[model samples]
Each structure stands twice: as structure tokens, then as C-alpha cells.
Target: RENLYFQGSPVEKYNFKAEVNKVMDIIVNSLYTDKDVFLRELISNASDACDKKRIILENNKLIKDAEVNDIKKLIIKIKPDKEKKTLTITDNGIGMDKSELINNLGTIAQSGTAKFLKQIEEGKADSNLIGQFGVGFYSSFLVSNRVEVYTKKEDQIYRWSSDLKGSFSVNEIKKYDQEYIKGSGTKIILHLKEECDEYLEDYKLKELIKKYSEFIKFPIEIWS
Candidate 1:
């Protein structure tokens, strides 16, 4: 289990929902266009993260004097790199710390997963069911084989990377005099699979954002 250790700590392990393989099998075998919904899912997830930050700051009753200009500009930037075969979706939002990543990404024992897994096992799973379960980030796997995230929160930077198979690892960012973002936000880099190369086209991404995420409360911009 040497692979279970990383960055000088024992790696935590998490499994998907019960009978999840059955669900994934359904996803891979089903001749479905559900993959087209991935960008919308990511946008919704980012919006919620920003909203969470707003609520927390307001409730704290301190440090609430943030400028209205920057306060309202919860920017979501989508940059696709054909050269690197990756797409990055960054948000100035409530970024996750280490424990939050584990809980959010691997919510097998969380509130809704048990029920959702039950539905999947019984052959009743659908998009609405998946939505209720509420893990939009997982949709990254529809187009990518791996995802890497850089999150800075509470003056700490962390890296959470996963290969979309069975396990993911979280570790602190080691700085060799490298400055990093001090603000609360997340940068998600998706390693697009071969079949998802169309996502690398800037024009294609802009069209998808316009079609699916234009109505979002925050500004979502595609890199030119």
C-alpha cells in the first residue's frame, strides 16, 4: 500500500457510494448525452461556493467592509489550453481546506449518498436523482481522466488531485519561495481525455458557456 502514502503523510482513502461501480457502468454503457451537461454542473458548483463565502462573511459581523466593486465581482474564468490538454476553471469563491475536500469529494457516508446509491442499485438513478445528491464536481470525469485543484483559504494553500478512479490525495503546497494567491478561491485544472478534445477549442467553450451558464448570477468568462 505504498501508494496509500504521499507527501510525508498517510493518505486517506474513500470509496464511492455503495454499488457505485454499477452506476458507473451504467454511465459508460449508456448511449447518453449527459456528458454535455458537465460545464453547467461546474458553473453551478462555483456559484454555490461564492454564495457560501458571501453568507459566511455577512454572518461573521466583522471584516464586512469589503468593497462593493470587488465584493460583487465573483469572477469565474474558464481557460482551455490545447497545448497542455487541460482546461482550468477558476473561481474567486469559498475555497476548500483539506478536510472539506475529503468530505465534499468523497461523501459516501454523507446525507444523500446512501439514498442515491440505493436508487442506483435498484435501477432508479437519473439526472434529477444525481442532482439531489449534489456533487457537481464529480461531473468532471465525464470529460477528464484527472483533475487538479489549487485552493487557498485561511492563509493556507492546498493541492487536491485525483485520477477519477478510486482514490484522491490532499496535501499542503510546498513553497520554494513561490508566492501564491492569498485570497479565498479555487483553481480547477482538468486533464481532458482524448475524446474530449473538442473542449480545448476556445470557440467551443464560449458557445457552451453562452448556452448553458449565461444565466448564472456571477460573471463567467471564457479566455480569448
Candidate 2:
């Protein structure tokens, strides 16, 4: 266990809330009839992250030119690596902090999007958000056996990974993939299960997005 930290990045691991395991059992196995809905939920979460940043920019309290520019170019990028058997969805939006990742993802029924909605009730915020069920993220398990999430909120970038077996880990990193997420955002990579190869096709992904997430305000791009 000690040698695991020899990589220099401090990693913290925690077991998913007991209920989360049950929820994952239901969601990954029997909740959604169509596997393609996984992409829809993920894209919805990405759109919510971008919208959260948009609201912060609207407040104009701690405004920075860099953040403003980042907000203007907010988009979701999807890349399916056939060789790696991974589907990566990246969004240039407000990413999560350590606690936020732990609470939002590890705990069942904790919808960060819902919480954000409640907070913005004081302002004249619009209702374009789609993901209300906190478990929407767990939908990734429906298609992939393992999921790796890399998120950047401000200066620090953190990596959170889990196999949905019962526990997850989070660690701070100095370097991350800058291909899609150039600024503050979150990138989720799903290591597709052997039977889930259908999601690896760019055309399949685009068709699903067109059918479900066509109304999302942010741009959704798929890499061929």
C-alpha cells in the first residue's frame, strides 16, 4: 500500500456509500433499457458543468479575463479510441474540487446539478439543465467496466478513478490531457467493456446525441 504512493501524487481512496453500491447494481444492470442512454446522461452532466460556469460568470464578482474567455468557448468533446477501447468525453466547464468529487460522485442521491439549481434560485437563472438524478453519472458503468475522470476547477487538477466494484480514488496531478480540456473542465474516459464495442463508433455516438441531447446549449463535438 505504501509503494502505491511512491508515484509522488497523493491518492485518497474511499468506499462508495453503501447505498451507492445498490444504486450502481440497479443502474448498470437493469435501470435503463437502452445502453446508448449512457452517453446522453454523460453529455447532460457536461452541459450542466458548463452552465454552472456560465452562471458564475454572470455574477461578475470574481471575474477574470481568462475565465471569461474559457466560458465563451465552452464545449463538450467526445473521442472514441478504438485501440484503447475507451470513450472520452471532455468539457471546458466548471470542474470539481476534491470534496465535490467525493460528495457528488461517491454518494448516491447527491445531485450537484440540483444543488446548483437551488443556489441559483436567487438569480434569474434559466432552466436548461437536464441531469437531475444524481445517479446519471453512474450510467457510465452501464457501458464500461472502468471509468477514469480527470477534472480541473482552478489551478489544481485531480484524477478520480473507480471500477464500480465498491470504492474509488482521487489524486492531484500536475499534468493532464490538454487535447480537449485546455482550461478548467472535466474529462471522463470510459474503458468500454468487450461487449460494449458498439459505442466505439463515431457515427453511433453522433446519432445518439442527435436523438437525445440535441437541445443542449453547449456544442457537442465528436472526434472521428
Candidate 3:
């Protein structure tokens, strides 16, 4: 078993198990005909996370007093940096722990959303949670050379990073440094490839979100 720890150096490096890597290859290269689909996949994933959080908050009345604030304000923010050549998407939702980060992102077809849906009773689950394929996260590789995920769960934040190589690393964000997502949520930074620079424009990202993700329930905001 991969050593599970909340603190460490390079925290942990894991290779995508063989089949996962193969599926990742297909996802990054040939799976989608429209590059814009990357943004939709990411937005959908963010929406799914928020939906999961909503379900938990609604179902568990015992913890209502403790977690009620989260239910009121769930949103997704998209920021594009032309100078750094990166696009960032952040969401305030149910964040992932170390084991969850590995099992959800490391494995190609294993979906945490699907698992959460199964745990909850049938009727209450949102049919809108769209990450059924578990491959939507990999769609990011279509536009990015590198991707970084910083997620906070129960006040501890972990970083998961990769370059579409066969291997990826997970580490703890030792400092309480990331300002993008202060609460329990996730921030995804995509280091854009030169060819994908068009995505760095404010209007471009806004248009893309409007075109594909306008139907998403959360407030999807873009930084100017």
C-alpha cells in the first residue's frame, strides 16, 4: 500500500498504474474533438463536487450547525494568466484528502463522484453530477503541459501535480499559503501550452464558460 501521511517531503510520488496511464494517453491526445470540452469537463467536475457537498449538508442534519455556512456559498472561479501562461479554476466544495486525491485523480476510471452517489440514498442524489467517466480530469492535459491541484479537506491542504508523464507526485502544502481557496475546496492550475494561449483572454474564457457551462448551477465567475 502507498504510505498514507499528512506530512512529508516530495510527499509521495506514484506512477499511474499501467492501464490508467494508457487511458490517460488516449484522453490527453485523441479523445475529444473539441479542445473547448476541457473547460466543460472541469466545470462539470467542480459542479459535481459542489453537488456532493450540498447533498451531505442537506442529509446530515446532525451537523447542520457546524457546516451550515458551507451550504450557503458554493461557487467556481476561473482565472486566466497571460503572463504566466496558466489557467486556474477554483471551487468551494467538498475537498479531497490524500487517499481520495490518489484514488480519484491517480486512477483513470475510478470516480469519487460515482462512489459518493452510491453511498447516499437514491432519490436525494443529484442526477446533474456529470463526472461518471472519471476521465474528465485528464481532459485538462489537452490544453495544458502541466496541472496542479491544491485541495483542502478538514483544514489540511494537499497538492497533487503532474505533467501527463507516467508519474505524478502528491505533497502537503506545508504553509497556509494558497489564497485562491481559503475554505474546504479545490484549486486547479493548468500550465498552458503555447498553442493554447488563446485561453488566456478574459473574454475568451468568459465566452467558453457561457457557451458550455452556462447551465451549471454554481456561480461561475471569471477574473478580469
Candidate 4:
């Protein structure tokens, strides 16, 4: 048993009893294929993020300062930096904190990552686990050797980075020298692997958005 504090109150710690590292290994390394699907995953995540921010601003009067922008103006931008071997996806949506990032991206539950791995191990790799377990972000590793996330919430901007090596690090972004963009958002940078260069092409990326996410309530743009 453990105790912690939040907002001046004590709270109990929530810990997992299972070997989560072993479970992450199976999910990240063995379960996925076809790196192109990461595009869909990113767009889906962006849409959800925008939806969340919209709800919070609508319900809470104290959050008005954070509601400086229109929710209907959400957009996703893709930039491929060939010289740096990186693909970046940016969106004006609800950004995550350190704990949310770890819970959502790092560990797996018995019914979550573990069950998804069980299905894949049983020869059901094609099963749609994205909706079930939110594994799409991890799919970034299919194409990227490293991943970096830049997020700015209501108060602070943080940068979280990882090489998909079963762990990640988060730190405050020191330079607020640049002007704020008038809303909350996040940017995901994927350092693409050599074999995944096809995503760097503009036509291929546009076609993907058209096919999989054309009806999304936000704008999706791709650049070379």
C-alpha cells in the first residue's frame, strides 16, 4: 500500500501487480504490421482530443481562459523532414500530461494490452484492436525509430520523448519564447525508419486521409 497527495489531499497509489514490461514487449514488437496505418491512428487521436477540449470548455466557466479558440477550427498537419528523417503530425487538441501519457501509452491492463496480445498470438493479428485498446499510438514505432511529443495544455508546455524502448521521459519545455497559438494542442514527431520512406510522399499521404478519414470533422493536411 502507498499514499500520495494531490491538491493538498492524500490519495492511494494505483499499482499494477503483473509484469507489464513483458506485455509491452509483445504488443510493440510482434503484434503490428504495415506502418501506413499510423496515419489513421493519428487522425483518430486528434479528433478525440479536440472533442475532449470542447466538452471541458463548454461545461466549466473557470476554464474560459483556456477556451480561447473555436473547436470547429481543429486541424491536423503532417510534415516530413527528409533531411532529418522525421515525420511530424501536429494538431490543436487536448494535450496529455506525464501521468496520462504513461497510463495511456506505456502500460497494459489484463483486458487491454494483454487481451489484445492474446488475440494476436492466436493468429488474429488483423483484429481491430485500435478501438478496443487504443494501440494506434504505439503503431508509430512500426515506422519510426524514435518518437517525440510536444504538448501545451492550459498552463504549461511539455515535451515527452521516447525511442519505443519500453520507457519514455517527459520534461518541461524551457523556451516559451515563441508565441502561443491561442489554444491547447499537441505535436507528434516520428523519426521514420528507412523502410518507411513512402509516407514522406505527399500523394500517398493525401490518398490515405481521403480513404480513411475524409469524413472527419476536422481538416487534415499533408506536406512533403
Clashing pairs in 3: none
**Tens digits of per-residue lDDT for model 2 on 1-224?**
36355135877888876754754455456532467778888898899999999898777755654485456798999999999999999998999988898887867444653353454455533333222334478778878889999888988788889988878888887655444356689989999989899899977988998987869989988899
Candidate 1 at residue 220, lDDT?
Answer: 86
The local distance difference test score of model 2 is: 0.77
Better of 2 and 3 by lDDT: 3
**Local lDDT at 60 for model 2:** 72
- lDDT (CA) per prediction: 0.71, 0.77, 0.78, 0.69
Ordered by lDDT, highest first, the candidates read 3, 2, 1, 4
- Give one digit per residue, the lDDT tens place, for model 1 in 1-224: 35655555555565555466445534433455356566777888788888888778676656565535355867888989989999999888889888887777655333454566567668787634454454367667678888888787677767788765656677776551273444788888999988889999988888888877766888887886
After TM-score superposition, the amount by which residue 203's alpha carbon in candidate 4 deviates from its true location, in angstroms, is 1.0
Global CA lDDT computed for model 1: 0.71
Kindly list the per-residue Cα lDDT of model 4 for residues 93-123, writing each as its tens digit. 8887656765665444534455667776797
TM-score to native of every candidate shown: 0.79, 0.81, 0.79, 0.75
State the weakest 10-residue window (summed lDDT) of model 1: 24-33
lDDT of 1 at 141: 68
RMSD of each: 4.3, 7.5, 7.7, 6.8
TM-score of 3: 0.79
Ranking by TM-score: 2, 3, 1, 4
Model 3: lDDT equals 0.78
